[PDB]
Design an enzyme around this catalytic site. Structure first.
Site, mmCIF file in Angstrom:
data_model
loop_
_atom_site.group_PDB
_atom_site.id
_atom_site.type_symbol
_atom_site.label_atom_id
_atom_site.label_comp_id
_atom_site.label_asym_id
_atom_site.label_seq_id
_atom_site.Cartn_x
_atom_site.Cartn_y
_atom_site.Cartn_z
ATOM 1 N N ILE A 11 -7.928 -30.384 -7.407
ATOM 2 C CA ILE A 11 -7.491 -31.580 -6.695
ATOM 3 C C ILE A 11 -8.403 -32.742 -7.066
ATOM 4 C CG2 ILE A 11 -8.877 -31.338 -4.601
ATOM 5 C CD1 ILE A 11 -6.466 -32.151 -2.984
ATOM 6 N N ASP A 12 -7.842 -33.948 -7.099
ATOM 7 C CA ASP A 12 -8.592 -35.155 -7.438
ATOM 8 C C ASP A 12 -8.782 -35.964 -6.160
ATOM 9 O OD1 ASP A 12 -9.909 -37.191 -8.682
ATOM 10 O OD2 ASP A 12 -8.248 -37.811 -9.971
ATOM 11 N N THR A 13 -9.967 -35.853 -5.566
ATOM 12 C CA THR A 13 -10.282 -36.542 -4.322
ATOM 13 C C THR A 13 -10.940 -37.898 -4.543
ATOM 14 O OG1 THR A 13 -11.558 -36.394 -2.270
ATOM 15 C CG2 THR A 13 -12.453 -35.295 -4.215
ATOM 16 N N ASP A 61 -3.076 -36.198 -5.807
ATOM 17 C CA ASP A 61 -3.060 -36.087 -7.259
ATOM 18 C C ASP A 61 -3.612 -34.731 -7.679
ATOM 19 O OD1 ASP A 61 -3.656 -36.320 -10.116
ATOM 20 O OD2 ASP A 61 -3.400 -38.482 -9.861
#
Ligand SMILES: Nc1ncnc2c1ncn2[C@@H]1O[C@H](COP(=O)(O)OP(=O)(O)OP(=O)(O)O)[C@@H](O)[C@H]1O
EC number: 3.6.4.-
Lengths: 337, 112, 112, 231, 113
Positions: free
Chosen positions: A169-171, A70
């Site tokens: 970034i969505d971790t 994502d």
């Protein structure tokens, strides 16, 4: 995986956001529902404002998922250029995942790098206020546990990267019982922004990270050890600066000479007190001498230099290590004069 | 606050003076200075330089009719206001604004 | 009325959306919150957050913690503190006012 | 610029929070009194339980006060981070006031910076759960009206930082005829927490913001405009 | 002063702690429900393991509620000391509300107690 135990093709759909956990186990039809690829499409058409949240059936049963990611393209940058960002984005992301695969997964670097760069899917959110799109590489299958372990590596990449996409970034989506919104549905019954598909891929069976169909041109890997065995990295955070460059900066601040300079290595620099003599007044407090020596400590990405005993007697100096990648390049280029 | 002159230039109103620049548009400065007079939910959008540029571009597409300047022949414009001559009173701020005075004496007015 | 009582609320206009505010909090805890579904705009200051410690805590660098953490709102920032023994874990603050680079510009212009 | 304005060695103190205005003007010994530096120490020694609230005696006669701030963080902070926190606190605070003193007060920026970072007096609460203190800048003199005008920019600074100390700045103290609790006294007869001095300052003359003594290293600045034109 | 401020006999209960904001407004029956006193008794008896949470339905409309307190003592306390503690606690708290009411609310102090 192969094909004999490919039961990971069904779609666990959650209706409402924040479903209570006391009803997921009972499989309440008012909250959950089993579906197939064809039936899912029809359920989308007959309900125009229905919200579906794709999720795993059971962790211990079928943990193999596609590598899904994502990105929230946001902030205020005027250079919002799309294509060169996405193609460049898929490059560094491809390298680190393959680099992690060859390190902690025992997989061939070139086989992983070929499959993931070969074919992938991409969506887009129509909300112009802030852009947020998912990316799903199709020909890379792995267990969910390695994604949780990879969380630290992915976050480190985001901090010291170039592109805004890989910077944002969505971790957080890598967790237990993760939920990914299906393409073409609303988030809440009020907002109308939905994820629109992108060409050339159109069918729904390539936009789900649970729909797994391993053909003869796919690669699979996973962790070897168990998840409850990870050991943290050393005191140093491989990602910023080589060890010898940090100490020479520390020695630059100290006008005096470090009598115990040699005994400092990549692991004992946080415990060995810097026993320094003061032929000149101290560079920090401008005092003649001191009762106790100085020490080092690494927090947040800096080296806190202080003195034990009565810390209020001497001031505290902070040494930074930039952390960027290209700034180190510029510093090295200007070094050579 | 923003006006269009007959020669094609834009005059803005900051620091109590009808100053204008053909090379440096002061519209963004006016927007960032006036951000204080908006509801709290509108201020947060006036921080991104991209958003201020968007607001400036949207403003530029609304000035259609020209406005002539320097029509009042009995007003002496200073740097911090316009001094009337009919009764000797001196205005400042919004009061000394309806008179579109372009040139100025160049120094501030001190009533003391 | 409230105007004469206190000019303070729990969520004033100008603040970011609650979901975005929690998202910023969630990125500080590198691990995953277990009871995330118990949070909303009305009880996030009372419900204790039970973090799952697979990796060392991103705040105190310890292997694990005895007690759950708990949020609190002061002066427009969600302070994160740990219940039980307060000295075991340090303090981290989540700003929610606005742009960061604007603060950098303000503080660079500040030093004259 | 006479002799009486270059000095103020009289201290006006209260004895209980929420004193009604009628008692204040009449200046009854039962609630308010005058004091000197030596006499204040004797009174505290003789009353180990008393409560005093330092405040200004007369507003329009003497507005000359030192620079003071209040901090109240409801969380303990370890020693090393506390030291690092106080370095960033002073750097940001000294710059911010200097900018305001230069842009709307017509004063020189660098003189203000030097006079603040050089000599400052810090207190320390005896409570262990939370960290609170009263930082008083020893060599920066201005009018109370300046602090009232400065209230806006200080509030913006407190809400636009990451350091816990500077974010917990009490901006509500800056009002008309304010009160600051003197070091060494309680807040109410039921409380048990008091403030204690810190090295190297030992005289109590370094903890009263109403004590005015313009020496060779002090600086003065105030507004040129008044509080009625600033709509 | 009308019936609305003289009467409130509708009860709004939750079904899970921390209802989403996007669902409470729409009054989704899967998360929220409005009940009367008689129907509430049937519902709690109907579901052996239900989890309800009472709350104010519309704040700006009906803000009138009773006086409530919550006590959480994590220490075993004997019944006799429990009995003697409860009244003095009641004596204390009644003084607190009455003291403020006469000070800031203008209520009759003796009528409050
Ligand atoms: N730490 C967390 N624990 C549990 N659930 C979480 C956590 N973080 C996020 N979520 C879930 O992830 C959802 C993501 O919603 P969000 O507002 O980010 O949507 P989006 O930006 O449109 O993108 P997407 O829904 O694809 O993530 C949240 O609504 C929430 O249910």
């Amino acid at each position: 995986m192969d094909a004999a135990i490919r039961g990971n093709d069904v779609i666990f759909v959650l209706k409402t956001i924040g479903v209570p956990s006391a009803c997921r186990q009972n499989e309440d039809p008012r909250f959950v529902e089993a579906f197939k690829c064809d039936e899912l499409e029809r359920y989308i058409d007959n309900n125009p404002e229905c919200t579906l949240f794709e999720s795993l059936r059971d962790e211990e049963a079928y943990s193999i998922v596609r590598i899904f990611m994502d990105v929230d393209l946001d902030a205020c940058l005027d250079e919002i250029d799309y294509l060169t960002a996405i193609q460049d984005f898929i490059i560094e992301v491809s390298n680190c995942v393959a680099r992690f695969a060859f390190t902690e997964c025992g997989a061939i670097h070139e086989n992983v790098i070929k499959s993931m760069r070969s074919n992938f899917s991409l969506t887009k959110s129509t909300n112009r206020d802030k852009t947020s799109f998912h990316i799903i590489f199709l020909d890379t299958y792995t267990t969910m546990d390695t994604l949780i372990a990879m969380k630290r590596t992915l976050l480190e990449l985001s901090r010291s990267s170039e592109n805004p996409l890989t910077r944002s970034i969505d971790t957080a989506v890598y967790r237990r019982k993760t939920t990914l919104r299906v393409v073409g549905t609303r988030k809440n019954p009020n907002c109308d922004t939905i994820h629109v598909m992108q060409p050339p891929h159109d069918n729904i069976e390539d936009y789900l990270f649970t729909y797994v169909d391993m053909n003869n041109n796919s690669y699979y890997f996973s962790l070897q050890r168990r998840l409850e065995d990870l050991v943290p990295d050393k005191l140093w955070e491989p990602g910023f600066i080589s060890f010898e460059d940090a100490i020479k900066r520390v020695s630059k601040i100290f006008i005096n000479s470090i009598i115990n300079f040699n005994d400092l290595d990549e692991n004992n620099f946080t415990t060995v007190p810097l026993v320094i003599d003061y032929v000149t007044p101290c560079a920090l407090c401008k005092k003649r001498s001191h009762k106790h020596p100085h020490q080092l400590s690494l927090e947040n990405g800096a080296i806190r230099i202080y003195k034990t005993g009565n810390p209020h007697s001497c001031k505290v100096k902070i040494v930074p290590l930039d952390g960027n990648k290209l700034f180190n390049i510029a510093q090295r280029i200007l070094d050579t004069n | 606050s923003v006006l269009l002159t007959e020669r094609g230039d834009h005059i803005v109103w900051i620091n109590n003076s009808w100053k204008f620049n053909s090379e440096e548009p002061l519209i963004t400065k006016l927007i960032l200075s006036i951000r204080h007079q908006l509801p709290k939910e509108y201020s947060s959008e006036l921080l991104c330089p991209r958003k201020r540029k968007t607001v400036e571009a949207n403003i530029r597409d609304m000035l259609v009719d020209s406005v002539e300047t320097d029509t009042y022949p009995d007003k002496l414009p200073f740097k911090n206001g316009v001094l009337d001559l009919v009764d000797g009173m001196f205005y400042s701020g919004d009061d000394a604004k309806k008179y579109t005075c372009t040139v100025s004496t160049g120094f501030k007015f001190d009533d003391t």
